[PDB]
Design a binder for this molecule. Structure first.
Ligand code: 6OU
Ligand code: OLA
Ligand code: OLA
Lengths: 244, 334, 635, 334, 244
């Protein structure tokens, strides 16, 4: 959906200046699960800040479903991102003083929607993510995987189009990580929604359909999978990450 | 739990209050001790004691409320983990009783398994004699007495097969096997099994199978066909059974028709009920009235609809609607 | 989602976590109300000393309010940084920056004002206990009454409203500054830093060991050594935490080899990683703790020896300089049914040279060594010794002057008479006193000569340095009786209060130092209760930022019974390291000028240090409780 | 349990000590109040508090130790009636758990009895057609075919009788009926029942019964005798079975002896075990091997001693020792 | 050495009963390198968990070294699990603050074997796994194929009786996977030590001596290999997997 074209971020703090990004070009379509992998020190987090409209940009044209984030004001941009985007972070941000249901229903409380639709949306999300039985527990007494699954389900209650997601595997073991990635892949197929993961773990990236390797200007290689069986793709991504 | 806690601890409180009452009372008999200062002391002791009582209340009246929380509604794990030694023993006793109940349940399960195993042992020790008796019977020469003996043997064989299928309807879930079935060999096998009944009752078979391929469970389909043929033979005399299979849409149907007494319309919806026996004829007492119920129960997971059309004095029509081929992929893959 | 419910739930969560903050607020408000009520009581005027008595409570209040304000502001700036994830999430959801302010400011005003209202009601309740405590350190037989003193209410309300206004202004800026974001090996530098820190601290101690005695023989050189020592000790304390702990811990780690158990793992990891970050905080805590302990101990040392110094300053129970006043006092004692002993001894103010007798340096000037003023008395009037010709015996001990002016063995003393000089020798030094401090300069001993030699010295009697009265008419009293009646009789003898008694000086000294002991003790208690909470909060954060480690360890076979055992040692080291350094600072501060105050040590320091350690430990245990709470929920 | 009680009530002791310290301090700092009276009061109150702690210890320790003895023992009444509300709550919770366990156990037992009754009804409805075939088939003409059919029917009837007595061995005590039994007619009936097998195998009988009258129950004794005769016939080939009954002292001895293959001495003690089958010949696999066990288990309530004397290659002697008449006096009266 | 008869685990929410073990009976002779593999919805992971002490048995009995440990008790079970049954998790589980030698020596510090014995044991263990040149590195500086070797060395040092390996080579490249498997096979060959390993990779399980194909909580045949080369056993394993 979004188009990356000559995306650059200005700098110039004190006297020393660095340009982390030196040319960015991506053209992707709905129903994709791209992973923008890379290397340490390449400013991938800076790419998240620029791409997620969190940090203001200076050069380049980016069109979110035909809408450019430089074509409106800061308040309008904030409303656009709050009504058309969703976020998942490395560490879950869950209030302790609320329930597993109220945590998921908090984003759609200010919009002033009738209770029945919100209840139906939570019901279907919790059933399709497998936490409906934990309907009214507290985040104090649930496992490590369920907290991250709840955080992921929070970013699906308002039906967005692009799901930005920093590394959702930092504080999870292998079983929970595999379960969460399987749930995300199931979410992608059912409802059309673009997911842009950014992680440097080949195990997490092997679940995707497209991998982009950023060296200094995001042009190193581009794997495409196509018809692999989640193991040959794993070896391919390992070889590509090890060649450099 | 204010009143309960206060009644629980009404001796320590009395001890402290008696302490301070004695301190006040020794102020009226000793001229070397004033009254205002003693009042001040008692005042700084009352305040401290009240605060301490409130804190000890709110700490200690938790476990005995969790116990009432767990008692009847739900949440077997409602009771809070013990912190003081005294509550630990209560929790241990409750857990011990629960695990004793679990052990009793396991022992009951083992006893049920042993009883069921003895049941199959008797089943096999009875099923061997029927085969031996059939082998011995297939050696005779006379007509009428031998026909009666064959009728009795077929009746017992059918009854034992009904009993075994009733036993197996509990584990049909793990024994299902769906494949292509040829209707003609199955019908011929059922006719051969029921040869003696038809010979004695003078009942023929009209085989007109436009459709020759069906998709269901072969064993249970043969069971249903045999039960329908047995019912038609028993409930009809000097009549020909017309068995017709035709393809309606994408689903195959098989029709069995008899020219017997028929079923009264008031009892037609209740034929499939468990243990149902008709009071129209005294001979219906010998019929167990269990084949139709078992057939309907087994046909439901096979996506086969059973319909009955009976008119008194005309006959009865039974039709089985075989499911579509595509509907079994969801059963094989899941 | 009915924001009121969220506010109420947040307040309920806040109360059960930061309860030490609430306790500190209540204690501070109560103590401030107690002092302000005590200041305005008209019964405070019975405390008679050099200082007025109602003008020291004002200084105590002004000192207390600053400490309370600093503690409150720092605690409230610690609290707000633990609520950054919530603010970032609320900004992502869609709330503005003028609603988060209200949401997390309406759950704080209720707590603060509840504490303020409760503290006042428990402050009218301790306002008489403080009076009774004060009227026992300074011996006064008055009575204390219970009242309200409405001025204290106004003062307390105004002060704490101002502090809360500062808190709110500080909170608003942080909220209006947040961005939507935020949602090894030893070098050659740390070695040098640690070595410099230890060397500086040791040099400071060694320089502080000399001070009063030896060099620095003026008023513009001593105030250089004091500044040098203070600066060196503070800088060494600061450099101890940055580098000198990492060096020692690294040596200990790379001395075991590779065999480490659970306790060593937890302790070494925690100390090495975290003790460096809080370098300015621990320095302040250590220095202020040392200052408080040292000041309190010195005040107690001075207040302890009042009886002995009063008995030493005046030789007898009463001292008289005028014959008319002495005979008047004896006349009033005649009909009081009290009998007395009177004795008088003439005294000669003569100067001699004893420059050859000290074992120190001639540079200890303190007057002309050939012109020291000494008191000369005979031997017939003395009933204790029988001296011979050419022999001189001194009087008194006065532990202070021994270190300032050491005395050697027998030598020669040249008498600086008008036109003659008879040499004598120093026989020995006594311990009792025979003349009041009026005739013996500051504390200089007095010489004893033979009667025959005295018959020539009094013949000389050079009138150049003689005092107003060369006589020691001093009356005594019989065995223990009613001394107080004779005390007011003596008081009414002298309307000019020119004579000296053996009780008024003791009472004045006891009052003057008791007030200081009272003030310093209460400020020290307040500082202790203040620092404990800050350390507790820092350890709370440290414990919450280590939960993963316990989870990993709990998968290899270790149970909670070992994790808690390791946590015990960790907390012991973490709360004990800042205490021993403060104890050493205070102990080396006390044992450098103790002789300027009293004559007996080791009695006060042990008591003060034991009290401080007990309170510090009772603050220590609650951190172990919190760690036990955290470990359980890390399966 | 001293430590377990002094660790559970540390807060109240600490509060009491702090109150004493507060009283002493305030008394000390005030000149009006003396400082000897408060000390004497402190000492007396401390001693009284020690006695009070002992008194409080006794009751609660006794009750809780009783409860802990209740949880793991064979005494359900070991729990004392609660005196304080917390113990009332604990007792109520335990009573509710016990009630739930009792309800579920009773439901389980009643259900299982229901399937047992249904199974027994099915067994009856299965054994009746055996009599139907017997009535139909007692008209055969050919000697060899009739002999084979009679042998098979007798084997099936023996299997059904063994199953029936295995079912009734759980209520044999409720079926006992002491009466005088004529041994000769019963033995003749048993011999005539086994006529087909002996005709097929050429087995004769010798009857020499010195003792004619015994005191026992007809049905179970007849079942035991029939099982012994059936085993003797099955384990013998073309041999004459001799039955001798003579009175030895005050006890009646009945001897069953056959000239068959006998029983191996190593297998002699193990014949009485349930389901024992001889491994010497594969023809014994079809035999259940439970008739001897059923007979032995039925002989115990009848106070009848069963003796075995077997020789390999010669035969087996089965001896039944009937009890004395006077020994039934104590059983009949009760 | 292991002996289990009629094991059954019922994992439910007290509302739905779904048994996953149907009375599995297994015998393992001491000194055998067996494997458990098959399908993805079975209970092989649960079977491996219940064979160890991490999970109890709802119905059945298990014997370890003859010593019955089915009645069980928390304080006794913890001691048994600590004193035997070395584990190799799917994750590295390495403490980052400590070096490579402290992690290996830590489990042995609750026995007080002085210093000479500990140093000798570490020398002996590290001489065979080829990590002796890494006595002082930190876990954040060595490759991803050596942390697994360090974990295996940790599990092998206190000479336990039965070693449970749960998917050891699941996130490694082919070269390091083969190296680690060869090291495991050599260690098993030299010193008698039973290893029970659960794998999803046929060439990883080709190094074994026996394979057990758990299918739907049942047995479904067993292989034995014997005197055959690795290649033919690999092809037989692949064919058997293809049949299922
Ligand atoms: C003078 C020498 C001082 C030495 C230092 C002593 C300090 C040590 C002690 C403080 C004792 C505090 C005792 C209470 C601790 C209990 C911990 C706790 O959990 O309290 C929780 C509540 O916490 C509170 O409310 C504490 C608020 C007051 C703290 C205690 C202070 C009382 C008044 C202070 C004394 C005033 C006079 C002082 C003069 C000496 C209970 O749970 P919950 O919040 O109701 O449940 C949550 C609902 N979902
Ligand atoms: C000076 C008059 C009294 C002033 C108020 C008293 C200050 C608070 C004292 C203690 C509060 C009660 C302590 C809470 C109970 C738990 C203590 C424990 O378990 O040991
Ligand atoms: C001179 C007086 C000394 C007073 C000593 C006080 C002793 C300790 C006082 C009370 C401790 C209360 C502990 C309650 C904290 C509960 C822990 C929690 O649940 O968070």
């Amino acid at each position: 959906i979004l188009e990356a074209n000559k995306i650059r971020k200005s700098y110039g703090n004190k006297l020393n200046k660095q340009e982390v990004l030196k040319g960015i070009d991506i053209h992707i379509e709905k129903g994709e699960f791209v992973s923008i992998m890379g290397a340490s020190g390449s400013g991938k987090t800076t790419l998240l800040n620029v791409l997620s409209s969190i940090d203001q940009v200076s050069h380049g044209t980016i069109h979110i479903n035909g809408n450019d984030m430089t074509a409106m004001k800061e308040k309008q941009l904030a409303e656009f991102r709050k009504q058309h985007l969703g976020f998942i972070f490395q560490d879950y941000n869950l209030l302790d003083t609320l329930t597993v249901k109220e945590n998921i229903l908090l984003p759609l409380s200010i919009t002033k929607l009738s209770k029945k639709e919100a209840n139906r949306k939570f019901e279907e999300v919790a059933k399709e993510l497998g936490i409906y039985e934990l309907r009214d527990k507290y985040p104090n007494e649930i496992s490590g995987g369920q907290k991250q699954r709840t955080s992921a389900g929070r970013a699906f209650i308002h039906d967005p189009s692009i799901i930005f997601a920093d590394e959702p595997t930092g504080a999870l073991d292998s079983k929970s990580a595999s379960d969460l990635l399987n749930k995300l892949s199931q979410l992608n197929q059912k409802r059309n929604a673009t997911i842009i993961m950014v992680t440097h773990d080949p195990v997490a990236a092997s679940y995707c359909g497209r991998v982009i390797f950023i060296k200094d200007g995001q042009m190193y290689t581009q794997l495409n999978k196509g018809g692999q069986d989640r193991q040959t793709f794993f070896q391919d991504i390992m070889k590509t990450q090890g060649v450099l | 739990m204010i009143k309960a806690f206060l009644i629980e601890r009404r001796s320590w409180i009395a001890a402290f209050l008696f302490q301070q009452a004695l301190m006040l009372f020794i102020a009226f008999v000793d001229p070397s001790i004033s009254f205002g200062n003693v009042l001040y002391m008692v005042y700084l002791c009352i305040l401290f004691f009240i605060i301490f009582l409130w804190f000890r209340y709110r700490k200690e009246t938790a476990f005995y409320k969790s116990l009432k929380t767990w008692e009847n509604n739900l949440d077997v794990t409602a009771i809070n983990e013990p912190e003081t030694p005294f509550e630990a023993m209560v929790e241990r006793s409750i857990a011990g009783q629960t695990e004793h109940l679990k052990q009793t349940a396991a022992r009951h399960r083992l006893a049920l398994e042993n009883e069921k195993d003895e049941l199959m042992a008797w089943i096999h020790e009875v099923k061997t004699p029927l085969t031996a008796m059939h082998l011995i019977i297939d050696r005779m020469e006379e007509k009428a007495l031998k026909s009666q003996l064959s009728y009795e043997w077929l009746r017992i064989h059918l009854l034992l097969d009904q009993q075994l299928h009733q036993k197996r309807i509990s584990f049909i879930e793990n024994d299902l096997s769906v494949e292509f079935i040829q209707l003609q060999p199955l019908i011929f096998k059922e006719i051969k099994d029921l040869q003696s009944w038809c010979i004695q009752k003078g009942i023929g078979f009209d085989i007109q199978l436009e459709a020759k391929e069906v998709l269901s469970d072969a064993k249970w389909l043969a069971f249903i066909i045999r039960q329908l043929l047995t019912n038609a033979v028993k409930y009809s005399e000097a009549s020909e059974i017309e068995i017709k299979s035709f393809q309606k849409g994408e689903q195959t149907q098989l029709q069995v028709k008899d020219c017997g007494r028929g079923i009264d319309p008031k009892d037609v919806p209740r034929i499939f009920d468990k243990g149902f026996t008709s009071t129209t004829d005294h001979h219906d007492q010998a019929s167990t009235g269990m084949g139709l119920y078992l057939a309907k129960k087994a046909a439901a997971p096979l996506l086969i609809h059973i319909d009955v059309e009976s008119e008194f004095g005309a006959g009865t029509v039974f039709t089985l609607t075989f499911p579509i081929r595509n509907q079994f992929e969801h059963v094989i893959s899941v | 989602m009915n924001i009121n419910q969220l506010i109420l739930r947040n307040l309920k969560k806040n109360l059960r976590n930061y309860y030490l903050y609430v306790f500190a607020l209540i204690f501070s408000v109560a103590l401030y109300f107690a002092f302000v009520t005590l200041q305005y009581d008209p019964a405070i005027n019975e405390v008679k000393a050099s200082i007025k008595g109602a003008a020291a409570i004002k200084t105590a209040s002004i000192l207390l309010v600053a400490v309370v304000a600093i503690f409150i502001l720092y605690a409230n700036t610690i609290f707000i940084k633990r609520r950054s994830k919530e603010i970032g999430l609320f900004q992502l959801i869609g709330m503005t920056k003028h609603k988060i302010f209200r949401i997390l400011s309406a759950e704080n005003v209720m707590l603060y004002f509840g504490s303020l209202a409760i503290g006042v009601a428990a402050g009218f309740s301790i306002s008489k206990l403080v009076l009774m405590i004060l009227f026992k350190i300074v011996d006064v037989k008055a009575d204390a009454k219970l009242h309200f003193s409405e001025q204290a209410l106004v003062q307390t309300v105004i002060v704490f409203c101002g502090i809360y206004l500062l808190i709110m202004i500080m909170n608003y800026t942080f909220i209006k500054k947040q961005s939507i974001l935020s949602l090894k090996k030893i070098s050659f530098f740390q070695m040098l830093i640690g070595a410099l820190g230890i060397v500086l601290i040791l040099t400071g101690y060694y320089v502080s060991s000399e001070l009063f005695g030896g060099k620095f023989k003026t008023i513009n050189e001593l105030f250089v050594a004091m500044s040098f020592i203070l600066g060196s000790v503070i800088i060494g304390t600061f450099l101890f935490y940055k580098g000198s702990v990492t060096f020692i811990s690294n040596i200990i780690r790379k001395s075991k080899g590779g065999y480490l158990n659970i306790s060593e793992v937890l302790s070494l990891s925690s100390i090495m990683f975290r003790m460096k970050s809080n370098a300015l905080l621990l320095t302040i805590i250590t220095t202020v703790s040392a200052l408080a302990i040292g000041l309190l101990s010195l005040a107690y040392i001075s207040y302890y020896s009042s009886e002995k110094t009063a008995e030493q300053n005046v030789a007898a129970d009463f001292s008289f300089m005028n014959e008319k006043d002495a005979k008047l006092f004896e006349n009033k004692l005649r009909e009081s049914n009290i009998s007395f002993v009177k004795k008088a001894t003439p005294v000669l103010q003569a100067n001699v040279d004893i420059a050859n007798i000290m074992d120190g340096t001639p540079k200890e000037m303190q007057g002309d060594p050939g012109n020291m003023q000494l008191a000369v008395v005979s031997d017939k009037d003395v009933k204790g010794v029988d001296v011979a010709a050419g022999e001189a015996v001194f009087s008194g001990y006065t532990d202070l002057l021994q270190k300032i002016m050491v005395f050697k063995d027998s030598g020669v003393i040249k008498v600086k008479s008008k036109h003659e000089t008879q040499p004598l020798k120093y026989k020995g030094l006594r311990e009792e006193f025979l003349v009041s401090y009026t005739f013996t300069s500051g504390g200089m001993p007095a010489v004893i000569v033979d009667d025959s030699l005295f018959k020539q010295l009094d013949k000389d009697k050079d009138p150049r340095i003689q005092l107003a009265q060369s006589t020691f008419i001093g009356v005594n009293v019989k065995h223990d009786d009613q001394m107080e009646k004779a005390n007011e009789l003596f008081q009414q003898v002298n309307k000019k209060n020119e004579h000296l008694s053996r009780l008024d000086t003791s009472a004045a000294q006891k009052s003057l130092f008791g007030m200081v002991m009272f003030i310093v003790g209460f400020l020290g208690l307040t500082f202790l209760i203040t620092s404990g909470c800050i350390l507790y909060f820092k350890q709370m954060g440290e414990s919450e930022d280590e939960k993963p480690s316990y989870t990993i360890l709990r998968k290899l076979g270790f149970t909670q019974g070992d994790l808690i055992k390791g946590i015990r040692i960790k907390q012991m080291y973490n709360f004990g390291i800042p205490l021993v350094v403060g104890l050493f600072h205070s102990y080396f501060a006390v044992q450098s000028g103790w002789f300027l105050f009293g004559s007996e040590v080791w009695a006060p320091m042990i008591m003060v240090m034991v009290l401080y350690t007990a309170l510090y430990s009772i603050f220590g245990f609650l951190s172990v409780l919190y760690y036990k709470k955290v470990i359980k929920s890390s399966l």
